[PDB]
Amino acid sequence: HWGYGKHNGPEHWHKDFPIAKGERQSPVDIDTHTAKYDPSLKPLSVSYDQATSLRILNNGHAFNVEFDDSQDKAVLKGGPLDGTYRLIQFHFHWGSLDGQGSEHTVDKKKYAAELHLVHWNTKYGDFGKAVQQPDGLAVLGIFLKVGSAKPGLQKVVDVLDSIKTKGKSADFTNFDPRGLLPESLDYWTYPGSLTTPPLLECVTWIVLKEPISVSSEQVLKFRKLNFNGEGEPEELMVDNWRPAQPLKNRQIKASFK
Numbered sequence: 627h628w629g630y631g632k633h634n635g636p637e638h639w640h641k642d643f644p645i646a647k648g649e650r651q652s653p654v655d656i657d658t659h660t661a662k663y664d665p666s667l668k669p670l671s672v673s674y675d676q677a678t679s680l681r682i683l684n685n686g687h688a689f690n691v692e693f694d695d696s697q698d699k700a701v702l703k704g705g706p707l708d709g710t711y712r713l714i715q716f717h718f719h720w721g722s723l724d725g726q727g728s729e730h731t732v733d734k735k736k737y738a739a740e741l742h743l744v745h746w747n748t749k750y751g752d753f754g755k756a757v758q759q760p761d762g763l764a765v766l767g768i769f770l771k772v773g774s775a776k777p778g779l780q781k782v783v784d785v786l787d788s789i790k791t792k793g794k795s796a797d798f799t800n801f802d803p804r805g806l807l808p809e810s811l812d813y814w815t816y817p818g819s820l821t822t823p824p825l826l827e828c829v830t831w832i833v834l835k836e837p838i839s840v841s842s843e844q845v846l847k848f849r850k851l852n853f854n855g856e857g858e859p860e861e862l863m864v865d866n867w868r869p870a871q872p873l874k875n876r877q878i879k880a881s882f883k
C-alpha cells in the first residue's frame with residue numbers, strides 16, 4: 627500500500643519491488659550536454675487522427691485518459707522504435723507547487739508537470755503482455771511549464787471535479803490528444819521503466835525537448851484531485867512524481883543537434 631508519502635513513497639518501493647534498484651529505472655536527469663546526437667534515429671511519427679478516447683479514471687495515484695486500443699487508431703512509430711506502438715492512455719505527474727512536479731529533469735530543472743502518452747508494441751498483442759517485454763512500451767513525455775493556458779487541455783481540466791476521488795470515472799469521448807503536443811517533435815530517448823510499482827523495465831522513453839505551456843489555473847485544478855476514496859479523509863493528489871534515478875550504464879540519445 628504504496629504511495630508518495632514519507633511512509634510509503636519512492637524510497638520504500640524497493641521492499642516490495644526489488645526492480646526499483648535495477649539497471650534501467652526511470653525517470654532520470656537528462657544532461658543535455660552529454661546526450662549525443664544520433665543520426666541513426668529514423669524520424670518520429672505520431673498518427674493520432676483516428677484516436678478514440680473513451681473514459682477518464684482517477685486510479686488513486688493519477689488520472690488516466692483511456693483510448694480504444696483494439697485497433698491501430700492512434701499510433702506512434704519511427705524515432706528509436708522498431709514497429710508500431712498503439713496509444714492506450716495518457717496521464718500526468720505534477721507537483722504541489724509550480725517549481726516541482728515533473729519526473730524527468732533537464733540539467734536538474736524540474737517542470738511543473740509532465741504528460742505521459744503511453745503506447746504498447748503491437749507485436750505483443752495487448753498491454754499486459756507488452757509490459758513483460760524490454761521493448762514493450764513507448765512513452766512520449768512532454769513537460770508542462772506554467773504560463774499561457776493550453777486550450778486543448780481545458781476539456782480535461784473541466785471534468786476533473788467529476789472524478790475527484792479514487793475509483794471514480796467519467797465518460798470522455800471525442801478528446802483529441804493532438805491538442806496537447808508542442809510545435810517541435812525534437813526528443814531525447816533512452817531505455818527505462820514504469821515509474822510506479824511494479825516498476826517494470828519495459829519502456830522506451832521519448833522525451834520531447836519543447837515544453838507546453840499551461841496556465842496556473844489549469845495546474846491548480848490538477849491539485850484539487852484526491853488520492854483517497856470518497857468518504858475517506860482528504861489527501862490532495864499532488865507530488866505524484868518519482869524522483870530521478872541513477873542512469874547506470876545508459877546513454878541518452880538526442881534526435882537533434
Ligand SMILES: O=C(O)Cc1cccc([N+](=O)[O-])c1
Pocket residue numbers: 715717742744819820821822823
Ligand atoms: O509510469 C507511470 O506513470 C506509472 C504507470 C503505472 C501503470 C501503468 C502505466 N502505464 O504506463 O499504463 C504507467
Ligand code: NI
Pocket residue numbers: 627628
Ligand atoms: Ni499496496
Ligand code: NI
Pocket residue numbers: 717718719742821
Ligand atoms: Ni507516467
